[PDB]
Amino acid sequence: GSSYSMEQVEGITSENADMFAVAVSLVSGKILYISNQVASIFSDAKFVEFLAPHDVSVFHSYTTPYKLPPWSEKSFFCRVSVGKEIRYQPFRMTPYLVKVQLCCLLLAERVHSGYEAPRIPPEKRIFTTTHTPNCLFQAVDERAVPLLGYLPQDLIETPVLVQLHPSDRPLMLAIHKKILQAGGQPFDYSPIRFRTRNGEYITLDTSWSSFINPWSRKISFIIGRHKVRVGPLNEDVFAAPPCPEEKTPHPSVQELTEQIHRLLMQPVP
Amino acid sequence: ITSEYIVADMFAVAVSLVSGKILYISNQVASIDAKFVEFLAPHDVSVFHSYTTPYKLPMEEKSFFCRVSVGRYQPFRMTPYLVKESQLCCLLLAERVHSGYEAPRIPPEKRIFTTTHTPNCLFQAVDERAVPLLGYLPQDLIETPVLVQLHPSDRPLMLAIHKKILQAGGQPFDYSPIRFRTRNGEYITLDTSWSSFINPWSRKISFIIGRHKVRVGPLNEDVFAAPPCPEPSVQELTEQIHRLLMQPVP
């Protein structure tokens, strides 16, 4: 029972040159309050209009009322652009429910490729991935965005094998065999090459594990903890690839995929 | 060409992955070419699209559900198959879903379903068996607050259950009755077995899994029917259970 609004929405973080705050009407979608420095790192309309069209559905999902925590991790990513081809910049955002009418304030921080000053120490370039037996990503942890160039939503529900170098795909078959064989005990395997947003591959040192349904004994998820031992040749992992986007065919990928899923259908006694 | 290969009460269709409805077959349900999604319920069109995007279409039969129109809407379990130098289609096997408490009622001991949710207490999944027994399709519960679904009375018991879940380190345990709201608005009573999936490196819980047995169904056997009633403490409570789960083990 408290409405900040007006200037009470103040709480500068600068004193980051890459952050900004914004309050958005939960009913209108209109930008009620917008923090300064925005034009710097680059209005008054619907905030979604400045987001990549693919990230709009994402923004609404994570800003849904029955979610979010009242102002006194639950953060998502969005590419923002002050119009223009158009130029976007990835932003990590944390949503907070706040009254002005109850809206939603968000702290947005510009994200930087972990391969460029300030470069993420190699011993800490660690991210994890989770996937279902059908081999489609289920989640990618936040540490992955800076090391891959993709935002979580770009990889969720897509073939795991597609991101792997074509010569490291058949390896996945043996990796899963050991995974259900290991019955949950993590094990190392390297190197595996994983494709980033800019079409460049990074070399990973991976530890594999699985979550086993105790009642059915069937594997529910495959979890990997990755350490990028060799980053890409081009440090800006968010740039675009000079290749005609992705595709659909995936001749061998489909084959290898169903082959693995079949394998993971067996109970792990 | 092969129409209705794998097979009563259930029909089939083949849809162009570029346009609409090519093949359709034997109708049967007592009640009476274009885009297939036109017949689907609005809120399921996205579901149908998602489960039929080419890079997902290929046993256990990893299907999905959605309501098709009549005249009225009925729940259907559909299994998508990618049938291919000419036309690339998606062969869909359909099958009317019957209330678990209806004529073909599921035997007591078999009225079992499971649920999974993330530390933030929002459903990440609900298995196939949950539909016939609860009236909801997975898409209705996914990403929604698990607490909102429990009887307002049983809600507090959820803070205790999670604490034990934390203390259990993965060891499953049975819990007294908890009341779960079904689609038609009625509460069913459950005998629940709880467990968790612990990330092996950070030792934090990634998913809470529950296996439920329905020991008391609803008075109105038709669980898919609409609820005879309109559609903060839950928000706050959720924040407690959420905070609590940030603790490692061990």
Author numbering:
A (entry chain A): 168 to 182, 187 to 213, 221 to 250, 265 to 276, 281 to 296, 305 to 473
B (entry chain B): 179 to 185, 188 to 212, 222 to 247, 263 to 275, 283 to 295, 303 to 449, 455 to 473
Paper's wording?
PERIOD proteins are central components of the Drosophila and mammalian circadian clocks. A structural feature shared by many eukaryotic clock proteins are the PER-ARNT-SIM (PAS) domains, which represent a diverse and ubiquitous family of sensory-, signalling-, and protein-protein interaction modules.
The structure revealed a noncrystallographic dimer, which, in contrast to dPER, is mainly stabilized by interactions between the PAS-B β-sheet surfaces that pack against each other in an antiparallel orientation. Interestingly, the PAS-B dimer interface includes the conserved Trp419 (corresponding to Trp482 of dPER) of both monomers as a crucial interface residue. Overall, the PAS-B dimer interface is predominantly hydrophobic and also includes two centrally located phenylalanines, Phe415 and Phe425, which establish stacking interactions to their noncrystallographic symmetry mates. Notably, the αE helix of mPER2 contains a nuclear export signal (NES) comprising residues Leu460, Ile464, Leu467, and Met469.
